[PDB]
Amino acid sequence: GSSGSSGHPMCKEHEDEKINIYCLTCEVPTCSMCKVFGIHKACEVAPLQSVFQGQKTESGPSSG
Ligand SMILES: [Zn+2]
Ligand SMILES: [Zn+2]
Numbered sequence: 084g085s086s087g088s089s090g091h092p093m094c095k096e097h098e099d100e101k102i103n104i105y106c107l108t109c110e111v112p113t114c115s116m117c118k119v120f121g122i123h124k125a126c127e128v129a130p131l132q133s134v135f136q137g138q139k140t141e142s143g144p145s146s147g
Contacts, residue, residue: 096121105131107138119143 108126
């Protein structure tokens, strides 16, 4: 009706990969390998741990 069971979102690229970090730009909970070794470079990932206000992305250049 309205309520129901729901699991955790898994990275689209890696069907079998427990999400480690969460993306902001696109607003999608993706892994880190996709951010450091993927297309999620220009995006802004944060420490899923807490994910407090303010960006924490310094290491890693941003591509077009
Ligand atoms: Zn992204
Ligand atoms: Zn991934």
